[PDB]
Design a protein around this motif. Structure first.
Motif, PDB file in Angstrom:
ATOM      1  N   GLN C  17       0.802  -1.234   0.000  1.00  0.00           N
ATOM      2  CA  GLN C  17       0.000   0.000   0.000  1.00  0.00           C
ATOM      3  C   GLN C  17       0.836   1.288   0.000  1.00  0.00           C
ATOM      4  O   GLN C  17       0.447   2.275  -0.620  1.00  0.00           O
ATOM      5  N   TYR C  20       2.432   1.227  -3.596  1.00  0.00           N
ATOM      6  CA  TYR C  20       1.401   1.613  -4.562  1.00  0.00           C
ATOM      7  C   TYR C  20       1.054   3.103  -4.466  1.00  0.00           C
ATOM      8  O   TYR C  20       0.664   3.708  -5.462  1.00  0.00           O
ATOM      9  N   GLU C  23       3.433   4.859  -6.673  1.00  0.00           N
ATOM     10  CA  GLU C  23       2.973   4.782  -8.067  1.00  0.00           C
ATOM     11  C   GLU C  23       1.979   5.896  -8.403  1.00  0.00           C
ATOM     12  O   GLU C  23       1.992   6.416  -9.514  1.00  0.00           O
ATOM     13  N   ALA C  24       1.127   6.264  -7.448  1.00  0.00           N
ATOM     14  CA  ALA C  24       0.250   7.434  -7.611  1.00  0.00           C
ATOM     15  C   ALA C  24       1.059   8.729  -7.769  1.00  0.00           C
ATOM     16  O   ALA C  24       0.678   9.610  -8.546  1.00  0.00           O
TER      17      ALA C  24
ATOM     18  N   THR D   9     -12.762  -0.699   0.357  1.00  0.00           N
ATOM     19  CA  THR D   9     -13.077   0.390  -0.582  1.00  0.00           C
ATOM     20  C   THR D   9     -12.038   1.517  -0.673  1.00  0.00           C
ATOM     21  O   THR D   9     -12.144   2.366  -1.555  1.00  0.00           O
ATOM     22  N   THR D  10     -11.062   1.543   0.237  1.00  0.00           N
ATOM     23  CA  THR D  10     -10.076   2.624   0.302  1.00  0.00           C
ATOM     24  C   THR D  10      -8.651   2.089   0.193  1.00  0.00           C
ATOM     25  O   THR D  10      -7.825   2.338   1.068  1.00  0.00           O
ATOM     26  N   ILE D  11      -8.367   1.345  -0.874  1.00  0.00           N
ATOM     27  CA  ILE D  11      -7.001   0.867  -1.140  1.00  0.00           C
ATOM     28  C   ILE D  11      -6.519   1.253  -2.535  1.00  0.00           C
ATOM     29  O   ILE D  11      -7.317   1.528  -3.433  1.00  0.00           O
ATOM     30  N   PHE D  12      -5.199   1.290  -2.677  1.00  0.00           N
ATOM     31  CA  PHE D  12      -4.532   1.462  -3.957  1.00  0.00           C
ATOM     32  C   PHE D  12      -4.466   0.138  -4.714  1.00  0.00           C
ATOM     33  O   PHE D  12      -4.305  -0.929  -4.114  1.00  0.00           O
ATOM     34  N   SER D  13      -4.580   0.224  -6.038  1.00  0.00           N
ATOM     35  CA  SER D  13      -4.220  -0.877  -6.934  1.00  0.00           C
ATOM     36  C   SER D  13      -2.696  -0.903  -7.077  1.00  0.00           C
ATOM     37  O   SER D  13      -2.034   0.051  -6.672  1.00  0.00           O
ATOM     38  N   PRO D  14      -2.129  -1.975  -7.675  1.00  0.00           N
ATOM     39  CA  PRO D  14      -0.680  -1.967  -7.946  1.00  0.00           C
ATOM     40  C   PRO D  14      -0.168  -0.787  -8.788  1.00  0.00           C
ATOM     41  O   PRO D  14       0.979  -0.379  -8.633  1.00  0.00           O
ATOM     42  N   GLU D  15      -1.028  -0.243  -9.646  1.00  0.00           N
ATOM     43  CA  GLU D  15      -0.686   0.894 -10.505  1.00  0.00           C
ATOM     44  C   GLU D  15      -0.801   2.260  -9.799  1.00  0.00           C
ATOM     45  O   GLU D  15      -0.426   3.285 -10.370  1.00  0.00           O
ATOM     46  N   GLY D  16      -1.324   2.279  -8.573  1.00  0.00           N
ATOM     47  CA  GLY D  16      -1.475   3.512  -7.801  1.00  0.00           C
ATOM     48  C   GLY D  16      -2.764   4.259  -8.097  1.00  0.00           C
ATOM     49  O   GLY D  16      -2.795   5.488  -8.049  1.00  0.00           O
ATOM     50  N   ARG D  17      -3.824   3.512  -8.405  1.00  0.00           N
ATOM     51  CA  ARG D  17      -5.160   4.070  -8.600  1.00  0.00           C
ATOM     52  C   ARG D  17      -6.078   3.594  -7.490  1.00  0.00           C
ATOM     53  O   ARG D  17      -5.867   2.522  -6.912  1.00  0.00           O
ATOM     54  N   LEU D  18      -7.110   4.388  -7.223  1.00  0.00           N
ATOM     55  CA  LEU D  18      -8.141   4.035  -6.257  1.00  0.00           C
ATOM     56  C   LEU D  18      -9.273   3.332  -7.010  1.00  0.00           C
ATOM     57  O   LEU D  18     -10.033   3.974  -7.736  1.00  0.00           O
ATOM     58  N   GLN D  20     -12.284   2.053  -6.348  1.00  0.00           N
ATOM     59  CA  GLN D  20     -13.667   2.512  -6.181  1.00  0.00           C
ATOM     60  C   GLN D  20     -13.950   3.878  -6.801  1.00  0.00           C
ATOM     61  O   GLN D  20     -15.042   4.104  -7.324  1.00  0.00           O
ATOM     62  N   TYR D  23     -14.154   3.217 -10.591  1.00  0.00           N
ATOM     63  CA  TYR D  23     -15.419   2.553 -10.911  1.00  0.00           C
ATOM     64  C   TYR D  23     -16.622   3.483 -10.735  1.00  0.00           C
ATOM     65  O   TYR D  23     -17.603   3.360 -11.469  1.00  0.00           O
TER      66      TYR D  23
END
Ligand SMILES: [Cl-]
Ligand SMILES: [Mg+2]
Lengths: 235, 250, 240, 244, 241, 231, 195, 111, 243
Positions: C17, C20, C23-24, D9-18, D20, D23
């Motif tokens: 986390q 990641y 990465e943002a 609902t409040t986590i990052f993907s591996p790429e650094g996107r949220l 939820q 979506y």
């Protein structure tokens, strides 16, 4: 997923064991205890040459009689240092005396296992806590995120630790002087470091009864590096 | 002995759908047909009393409910969910309005409060959405007569006439042909009975149909005399006999 | 309350986390910081996918924390506001109790501590933000430039860049910035900052923002025309 | 325990996107288009209704355009029920500011507050975000006429002209083509309606499909008037511009 | 497939945990019946004591909720007792707050509302029981109101619950089709109990001894259960005509 | 397998795997022995070091003047549980002017461990304890397991290779129970018992840890040159 | 704290505040500045119970300075006075209220007008051409009722203020050790060093 | 009205020598004009070669001594059986007393 | 599938598999019994001697609640202790408010509702014990047995644990051969016999017998442990019957 405080089938806490892997990725820190004092040294490891290396604070004062070096996720150490400083000052307020090094270490280690679903994960940093008190003299402790601490005559932590520890095994004896211990930390740091050791990418410190805890100047460490090079070339 | 479900059970899927809301709308589709029609001088709401057993006394189960003296409600979907919403809707009409302003809320604002409660079950921790769609008919002094639909999402829309549940697609088409802006209340009741006959299989009479109106003030139903301004409830539930009379002229 | 441990260790000793969140930051628009002998300059990229914008009222990328300290960032914009607000509150609280404005190091240490806290608290994710914090300490003429990141580590930099294609601009700065003799004037420092952004930006002057901070609370933002003059002079010298 | 059923609902993907937030934005892309255009002498808000039925009572209906105070209005794209939760919070914030300072709330301060509420739902609490994007149209005495947008991430930005909801890519290209800085309200009205008329998924654009509003400093003696257009008034402006 | 483990909607608009709670209802393999007289409401239930080591006096699924209200449960005994204790507490609290005895239908509504909450809130499971409430209400007269794990409830002229409910239900339906009235036209409760036992015998096709049945009777101002000897007196009268 | 993710889940054969995994942490811990006579009770503990530079981890903790324990497994969990015992011993003294019974101390530890095995979020304790004491009914020895099970015994051992010491005590039962009014001979029997669990390593001066409590003997810990007598 | 005065003239607001700090028997200090700059064009003077006065003034100062950084904008005097009033009106129904009375003198840069607000510890706000808190007003209001005109210059305002201070030095029992005078106008806040 | 304090009388005396110290107290305990006891010990051995007496209201005195004795016990547990020095004992007692600053222990203490 | 992974989940059968898994822990434990007699109740339990190092008569398993109720259980011993601790709190609050000691049926429901509550949520585990309990109240003697589901009934005789089938058979003979009833002293002897007969299922390790009783005549309606001569008399009777 799975619990944060879960035991593995071997009888170990998953999260504690995984935090120990984070500590292996950290920069090297070495401590050597003697009858003349305890020496604490670290690898700074700047990620780029534009980074002003003097701002890398991996050796830290807790009280006048207690110093601390760190290795791993160094941001996690700030709240541990804050607790140690408060515990040291608070004990002086309640008892009009310096707090024992062991008792201070124990207080820091009580935080470690306060995690669950309190903080959400263990600390990702190991500490070398060095100090002096009147009862047990010059002491060095290794504080882990498991909540365990061991006293050591000498100890290395971080990426070069097993290589450094084997070297400390051979070199340490009970009659070591402070000057000898300083050179020995610089020697072993130079051995395990990727980049070439100098005054800007490595830092020394010590704790004596007379002068207390002191982080060494870059000019002072530079002379000890020059003294080391000459004595190795001497045979 | 802990409520650990502090997280949302309704979330966005990759396609942008809120699954639980869609699935709640599916539960509403399976439910029995109910409708509402708005006239010039009134509003009518109606539904089938689908009796679970002939031994059961269907009079005791009220699908059409008074919320305030001038506002009534009917549903399609899960009956228990509707019952607790009627309890909460009656209470919020007092707590968030009557105890402040000394008068009953207008239809649109009571609808808004019910809508809010249904939205919260779509976002709050550890709950599912309500499995109902409501039709709320009412009158107030400044807005006149009105008819509203409320869905599991919390969304609400005003209607001239509509239907929800089982045969709503067919029923809405039937109402589009018959509805005009010059309808009297009796004409709207007649159209409501015609529309509802299409979606009912079995018996079709006053005992198997539940129908109520929002119409003229009923001083005879008030229960007291002596205050000129209090003229009586505009909500009235039609009796079994009153429905059967209109079924002869059908 | 929602207590779930979102930031946790994985078998290889990583906190995903937190990684990641970096990465943002990599996705965010480029930001750069260069300190001269008697100044610090903060350069920022504005992506030109968004035209028909209102540049008067759109949130500017560089934010004043106090009259003597500024904060720029790369990463999630919404997240950055939360850090900026907390930093502004702490700056006034420090003035109230210590009767002295914050040092740049102190303000950095606070922001960094907030970022760290969100990596080991239940029910929260890390900030998807790295910051450049720059200014001058009270009654001091030595320039200060610090960097923070989602993990909570912070450090001081002679010059530094963060955000998208920051690898390229850091490469540029590592060869062009001399420590023994930094940019002596404001002109020289702004020029080096614009030059470094021109490696990545690939458009004229609307996509570059510059803010100059000098000692004794002297902060000014350059206009489009002032920046466009630097862009003109750099490319005319380059044609040779 | 309960961990098993937590969507997180409040986590990052591996790429650094949220997850939820992304979506939620996908949900909003299917909602009816809303357009905001800012002129020198006013702001236009135009929006397309989603549920065409002949039996919908239009004159008492409100799904798109909501009033926040006398100086500030919003156009909604997304879940209407979610938007109403946020709208009522924004109405309260405006009145809290008026009570405290005895001055109408500046537009940006209101926008920032709502945007911060949305941000919170992406970083903590384990709840789903609000599936709403707003176009804010407002006036204050500092910056004059202002247009903003916010989305489920809690990020907000200022605009001269902007669209949200369906077909924004197409809409934003058309606005970028015909917009000019010296433009007036009457011209901006025409631009808003022409842009919807081309981007709409429907066969033709009619009065019963639209919600329309203007904020003008063209009231009696230098005040600011919010006009939410009635159905007949939308029908008249459609004939005037030459769409029907 | 976690939509089958907790009370959230499946794609069909169904709550599987509610449906599975309905199946737990029949785990005891007991059938209950309730009918209304002129002055009374009778409830009968099968009593099965398989183990000889059990104390048969403690084996029961009929509960005295208040002085006026009785409750028979179809479902496992822990959930039955959970429901009983709550209904008792709710009935007592109602009397204290509002100054009159909780009506049978109002208690049924209250317990049904509580059951509804378990179908909407995830952390609480539904109770695997059907609750049949009986009384002679001071306003409505003889009353039968029944609650289930969906939170559904309704009033009844008569009712039956259990594995063989449909057989009992149709038997009762056919009687009321003949008589063309909503009750058993009988003065004494004793004869209404005899009717209830007789029509259960006909519907199930089994004979009953004194220890095979359990009976509850609601009259004006009291609800009481019959002893084994009181039931024996009932069984003798049925056999003699 | 699927039923070991948390402490709140039974397996299909009625087992609690997280508790059993905690039990495993004790078997990995260093050996410690407990035994008693009618007059005295003795703890003997083999301390473990990290390497030759490190100290040997302390195994024995004092709870009161008349009671203490030895640990095997997670040391921080022994610290939490011993602190709880210290407080309960202390509460008994301050409120009732009464030394806490050793049997009652065991009951309190049992119930504290149990709560962690039935509730979600928490974990079982990862340590085993041998509690010795002298109270109003004489000498006592207890064994604590983090499942909650507490057992009163004449002698026992826990940790790695503990079965060797436990067999010796099972043979010696009739001899060492009779060692009354002779602390040195009772310690000898404990040191001889722990020797049966050794392999490769032997008992050195900074390796061995002994504790004793008895009739006119407070709970005292012997380390260093104080245990050279018994090597 | 004893005497605080305010007077609004044509193009400025003048605040005069006493220098004495007295505890019981002794005058501890004779050079105390009973004011805080809230923003570049807004000054607040204060008087009331020991401790409360400075704590409240600095708390307001911190909040207005926070607002100024957040919005990059100066609140109008009217807006600052309304914020201060609400804080005091909230305070009066607390466990321990702030016993502090204030004058707020500001120059509104939008309207190009000086403004003077008098607010007491209860949260009672009034806009005035001239104001005073405590026993001062018993002497000074009658003077100002006689001598004040709205179109006076800043120099005329200072002379009119000297006439107030002379009267207070003649007729009040306490030695307040003179006044620090500050002027608030379009150019900001400055202190008159000789008075 | 209920009065939570009382006066049990008594008098105490500490004198420091070169390599010794004494703490003396009378053994009488009283309320008003009644004698409660002729022998009620008031000076206590607290361990670590420290003697203590908290004279005045006997219930507060007993409570304070009891809490200090316990403080010595927990000082041993928490700091490896280290001897509590007299200066450290004194500072600890200050915190015990000041902890009840707004509902005081009604005693005069000597160690 | 997955219905057995979480407590309080109904399977498609209408079963709570986690509760059924708790029953397996109970079936794994040592044998314990209860016998209702003329004016009271008798409780007995099998204690397995794991080692010679166990101190005889010291590791007591049967527990008293208030002064008139005895509790014994088979399964996870700590779970049983937790339940008795709650039982003691329930009995104390009853006596505090109502003065009279808690009646046995009242006490049975207090335990029953508490055990049942641990089948309502996934955040808790069911109890891994079946508990046999009872005593003497104003209405006479009462014996109960309580399962992991919260289910309980009154009993003439009760048995649980590994030897339950053997014990249940023996108890059924006593009910048939003594309809007029069994005396308290007889019930102690018979309890010893039944534990000895039930030990054939745990026959590897030798065991220790433990008995307790409440009787209106023999103990004044108070719970007491059987000790000394009366215990040895019951052991001798049991040893004679197996041979
Ligand atoms: Cl309710
Ligand atoms: Mg549920």
């Amino acid at each position: 997923d799975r619990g944060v405080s879960t035991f593995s089938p071997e009888g170990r806490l998953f999260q504690v064991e995984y935090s120990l892997e984070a500590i292996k990725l950290g920069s090297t820190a070495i401590g050597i205890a003697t009858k003349e004092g305890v020496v604490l040294g670290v690898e700074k490891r700047a990620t780029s040459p534009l980074l002003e290396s003097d701002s890398i604070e991996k050796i830290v004062e807790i009280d006048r009689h207690i110093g601390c070096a760190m290795s791993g996720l160094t941001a996690d150490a700030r709240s541990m240092i804050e607790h140690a400083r408060t515990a040291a000052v608070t004990h002086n307020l309640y008892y009009d005396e310096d707090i024992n090094v062991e008792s201070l270490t124990q207080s820091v280690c009580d935080l470690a296992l306060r995690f669950g679903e309190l903080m959400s994960r263990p600390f990702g940093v190991a500490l070398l806590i060095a100090g002096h008190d009147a009862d047990d003299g010059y002491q060095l402790f290794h504080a882990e995120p498991s909540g365990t601490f061991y006293r050591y005559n000498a100890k290395a932590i971080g990426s070069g630790s097993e290589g450094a520890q084997a070297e400390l095994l051979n070199e340490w004896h009970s009659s070591l002087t402070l000057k000898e211990a300083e050179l020995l930390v610089l020697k072993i740091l130079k051995q395990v470091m990727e980049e070439k050791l100098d005054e800007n990418n490595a830092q020394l410190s010590c704790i004596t009864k007379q002068d207390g805890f002191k982080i060494y100047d870059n000019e002072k460490t530079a002379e000890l590096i020059k003294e080391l090079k000459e004595k190795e070339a001497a045979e | 002995m802990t409520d650990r479900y502090s997280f949302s059970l309704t979330t966005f899927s990759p396609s942008g759908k809120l699954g639980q809301i869609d699935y709640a709308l599916t539960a509403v589709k399976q439910g029995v047909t109910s409708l509402g029609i708005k006239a010039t001088n009134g509003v009518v709401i109606a539904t089938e009393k689908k009796s679970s057993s002939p031994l059961a006394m269907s009079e005791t189960l009220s699908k059409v409910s008074l919320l305030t003296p001038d506002i009534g409600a009917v549903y399609s979907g899960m009956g228990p969910d509707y019952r607790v919403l009627v309890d909460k809707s009656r209470k919020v009409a007092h707590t968030s309005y009557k105890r402040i302003y000394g008068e009953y809320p207008p239809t649109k604002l009571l609808v808004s409060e019910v809508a809010k409660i249904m939205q919260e079950a779509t976002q709050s921790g550890g709950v599912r959405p309500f499995g109902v769609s409501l039709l709320i008919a009412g009158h107030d002094e400044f807005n006149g007569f009105s008819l509203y639909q409320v869905d599991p999402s919390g969304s609400y829309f005003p209607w001239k006439a509509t239907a929800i549940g089982k045969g709503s697609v067919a029923a809405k088409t039937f109402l589009e042909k018959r509805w005009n802006d010059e309808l009297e209340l009796e004409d709207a009741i007649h159209i409501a009975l015609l529309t509802l006959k299409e979606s009912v299989e079995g018996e079709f009479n006053g005992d198997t149909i539940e129908l109520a109106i929002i119409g003229d003030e009923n001083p005879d139903l008030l229960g007291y005399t002596g205050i000129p301004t209090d003229k009586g409830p505009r909500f009235r539930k039609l009796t079994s006999q009153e429905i059967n009379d209109r079924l002869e002229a059908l | 309350g929602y207590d779930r441990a979102l930031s946790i260790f994985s078998p290889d000793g990583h906190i995903f986390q937190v990684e990641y969140a970096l990465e943002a930051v990599k996705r965010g628009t480029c930001a750069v910081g260069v300190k001269g002998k008697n100044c610090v300059v903060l350069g920022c990229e504005r992506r030109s996918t968004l035209k028909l914008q209102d540049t008067r009222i759109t949130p500017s990328k560089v934010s004043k924390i106090d009259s003597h300290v500024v904060l720029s960032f790369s990463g999630l914009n919404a997240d950055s506001r939360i850090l900026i607000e907390k930093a502004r509150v702490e700056a006034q609280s420090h003035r109230l109790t210590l009767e002295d404005p914050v040092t740049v190091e102190y303000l950095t240490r606070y922001v960094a501590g907030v970022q760290q806290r969100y990596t080991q608290s239940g029910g929260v994710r890390p900030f998807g933000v790295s910051t450049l914090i720059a200014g001058f300490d009270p009654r001091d003429d030595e320039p200060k430039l610090y960097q923070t990141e989602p993990s909570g580590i912070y450090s001081s930099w002679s010059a530094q860049t963060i955000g998208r294609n920051s690898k390229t601009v850091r490469e540029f700065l590592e060869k062009n910035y001399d420590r023994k003799e930094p940019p002596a004037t404001v002109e020289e420092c702004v020029k080096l900052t614009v030059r470094s952004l021109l490696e990545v930006v690939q458009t004229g002057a609307k996509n570059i923002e510059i803010t100059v901070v000098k000692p004794d609370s002297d902060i000014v933002a350059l206009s489009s025309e002032e920046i466009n003059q630097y862009v003109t002079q750099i490319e005319q010298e380059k044609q040779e | 325990g309960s961990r098993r059923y937590d969507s997180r609902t409040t986590i990052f993907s591996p790429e650094g996107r949220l997850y939820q937030v992304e979506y939620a934005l996908e949900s909003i892309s299917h909602a009816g288009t809303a357009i905001g255009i800012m002129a020198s002498d006013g702001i236009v808000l135009a929006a397309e209704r989603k549920v065409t039925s002949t039996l919908l009572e239009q004159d008492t209906s409100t799904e798109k355009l909501y009033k926040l105070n006398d100086k500030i209005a919003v156009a909604v794209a997304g879940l209407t029920a979610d938007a109403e939760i946020l709208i009522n919070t924004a109405r309260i914030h405006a009145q809290n500011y008026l009570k405290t300072y005895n001055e109408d709330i500046p537009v940006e301060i209101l926008v920032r507050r709502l945007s911060d509420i949305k941000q919170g739902y992406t970083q903590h609490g384990g709840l789903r975000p609000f599936g709403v994007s707003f176009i804010y149209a407002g006036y204050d005495d500092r910056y004059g006429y202002q247009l903003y947008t916010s989305n489920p991430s809690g990020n907000y930005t200022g605009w001269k002209a902007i669209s949200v909801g369906a077909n924004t890519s197409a809409a934003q290209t058309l606005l970028q083509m015909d917009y000019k800085d010296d433009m007036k309200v009457d011209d901006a009205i025409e631009l808003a309606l022409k842009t919807l008329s081309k981007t709409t998924d429907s066969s033709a654009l009619t009065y019963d499909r639209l919600e329309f509003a203007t904020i003008r400093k063209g009231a009696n003696d230098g005040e600011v008037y919010q006009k939410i257009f009635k159905p007949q008034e939308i029908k008249d402006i459609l004939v005037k511009t030459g769409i029907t | 497939g976690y939509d089958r483990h907790i009370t959230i909607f499946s794609p069909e608009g169904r709550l599987y945990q509610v449906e599975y709670a309905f199946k737990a209802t029949n785990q005891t393999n007991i059938n209950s019946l309730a009918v209304r007289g002129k002055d009374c409401t009778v409830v009968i239930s099968q009593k099965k004591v398989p183990d000889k080591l059990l104390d048969p006096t403690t084996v029961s699924y009929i509960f005295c909720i208040s002085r006026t209200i009785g409750m028979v449960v179809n479902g496992p005994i822990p959930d039955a007792r959970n429901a009983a204790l709550r209904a008792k507490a709710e009935a007592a609290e109602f009397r204290y707050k509002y100054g009159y005895d909780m009506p049978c239908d109002v208690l049924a509504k209250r317990m049904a509302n509580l059951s509804q909450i378990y179908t909407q809130r995830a952390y609480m499971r539904p109770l695997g029981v059907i609750l049949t409430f009986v009384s002679v209400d001071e306003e409505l007269g003889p009353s039968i109101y029944k609650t289930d794990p969906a939170g559904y409830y309704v009033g009844y002229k008569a009712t039956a619950t259990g594995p063989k409910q449909q057989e009992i239900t149709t038997n009762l339906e056919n009687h009321f089709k003949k008589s063309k009235i909503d009750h058993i036209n009988e003065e004494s409760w004793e004869k209404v109990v005899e009717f209830a036992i007789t029509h259960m015998i006909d519907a199930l096709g089994t004979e009953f001894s004194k220890n095979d049945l359990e009976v509850g009777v609601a009259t004006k101002d009291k609800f009481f259960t019959l002893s084994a000897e009181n039931i024996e007196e009932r069984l003798v009268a049925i056999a003699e005509q | 397998n699927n039923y070991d993710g948390d402490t709140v889940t039974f397996s299909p054969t009625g087992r609690l795997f997280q508790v059993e995994y905690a039990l495993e942490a004790i078997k990995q811990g260093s050996v410690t022995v407990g035994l008693r006579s009618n007059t005295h009770a003795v703890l003997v503990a083999l301390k473990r070091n990290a390497d030759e530079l490190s100290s040997y981890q302390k195994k024995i903790i004092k709870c009161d003047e008349h009671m203490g324990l030895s640990l095997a497994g997670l040391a921080p969990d022994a610290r939490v549980l011993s602190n709880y015992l210290r407080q309960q011993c202390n509460y008994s003294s301050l409120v009732f002017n009464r030394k806490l019974a050793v049997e009652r101390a065991g009951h309190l530890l049992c119930d504290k461990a149990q709560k962690n095995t039935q509730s979600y979020g928490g974990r079982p304790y990862g340590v085993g304890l041998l509690i010795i004491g002298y109270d109003k009914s004489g000498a006592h020895l207890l064994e604590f397991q983090p499942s909650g099970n507490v057992t009163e015994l004449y002698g026992t051992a826990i940790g790695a290779r503990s079965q060797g010491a436990k067999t010796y005590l099972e043979r010696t039962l009739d001899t060492f129970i009779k060692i009354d009014g002779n602390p040195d001979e009772l310690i000898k029997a404990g040191v001889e018992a722990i020797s049966q669990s050794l392999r490769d390593e032997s008992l050195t001066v900074d390796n061995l840890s002994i504790a004793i409590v008895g009739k006119d003997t407070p709970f005292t810990i012997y380390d260093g040159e104080a245990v050279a007598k018994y090597i | 704290m004893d005497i605080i005065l305010g007077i609004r003239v044509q193009d400025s607001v003048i605040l005069a505040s006493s220098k004495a700090v007295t505890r019981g028997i002794s005058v501890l200090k004779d050079s105390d500045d009973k004011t805080r700059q809230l923003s570049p064009h807004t000054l607040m003077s204060f008087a009331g119970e020991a401790g409360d006065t400075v704590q409240f003034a600095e708390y307001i100062q911190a909040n207005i300075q926070l607002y100024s950084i957040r919005e990059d904008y100066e609140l109008s005097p009217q807006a600052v006075s309304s914020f201060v009033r609400q804080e005091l009106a909230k305070s009066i129904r607390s466990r321990r209220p702030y016993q502090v009375n204030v004058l707020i003198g500001g120059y509104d840069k939008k309207k190009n007008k000086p403004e003077l607000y008098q607010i007491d510890y209860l949260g009672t706000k009034v806009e005035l051409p001239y104001g005073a808190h405590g026993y001062s007003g018993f002497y000074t209001f009658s003077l100002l009722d006689h001598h004040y005109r709205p179109d006076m210059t800043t120099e005329e305002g200072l002379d009119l203020l000297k006439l107030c201070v002379q009267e207070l030095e003649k007729r009040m029992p306490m030695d307040f050790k003179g006044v620090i005078v500050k002027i608030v106008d379009k150019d900001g806040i400055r202190q008159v060093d000789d008075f | 009205q209920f009065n939570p304090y009382g006066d049990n009388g008594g008098t105490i005396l500490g004198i420091a020598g070169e390599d010794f110290a004494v703490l003396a107290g009378d053994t009488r305990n009283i309320t008003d004009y009644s004698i409660n006891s002729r022998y009620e010990p008031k000076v206590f051995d607290c361990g670590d070669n420290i003697v203590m007496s908290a004279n005045g209201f006997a219930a507060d005195g007993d409570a304070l001594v009891k809490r200090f004795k316990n403080s010595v016990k927990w000082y041993h547990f928490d700091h490896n059986d280290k001897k509590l020095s007299i200066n450290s004992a004194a500072r600890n007692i200050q915190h015990l007393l000041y902890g009840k600053r707004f509902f005081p222990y009604y005693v005069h203490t000597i160690i | 599938t997955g219905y057995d992974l979480s407590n309080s989940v109904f399977s498609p059968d209408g079963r709570n598999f986690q509760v059924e898994y708790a029953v397996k822990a109970v079936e794994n434990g040592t044998t314990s019994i209860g016998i209702k007699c003329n004016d009271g109740v008798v409780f007995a339990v099998e204690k397995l001697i794991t080692s010679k190092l166990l101190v005889p008569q010291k590791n007591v398993k049967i527990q008293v609640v208030d002064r008139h109720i005895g509790c014994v259980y088979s399964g996870l011993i700590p779970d049983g202790r937790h339940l008795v601790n709650r039982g003691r709190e329930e009995a104390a609050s009853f006596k505090k408010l109502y003065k009279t000691p808690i009646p046995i049926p009242a006490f049975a429901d207090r335990l029953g509702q508490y055990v049942q509550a641990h089948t309502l949520y996934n955040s808790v585990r069911p109890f891994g014990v079946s508990t046999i309990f009872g005593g003497v109240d104003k209405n006479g003697a009462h014996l109960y047995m309580l399962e992991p589901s919260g289910s309980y009934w009154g009993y003439k005789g009760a048995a649980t644990g590994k030897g339950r089938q053997s014990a249940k058979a023996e108890l059924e003979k006593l009910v048939d051969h003594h309809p007029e009833g069994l005396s308290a002293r007889e019930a102690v002897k018979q309890a010893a016999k039944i534990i000895y007969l039930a030990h054939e299922d745990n026959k590897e390790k030798d065991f220790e017998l433990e008995i307790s009783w409440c009787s209106l005549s023999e103990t004044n309606g108070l719970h007491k442990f059987v000790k000394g001569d009366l215990l040895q008399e019951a052991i001798d009777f049991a040893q004679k019957e197996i041979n």
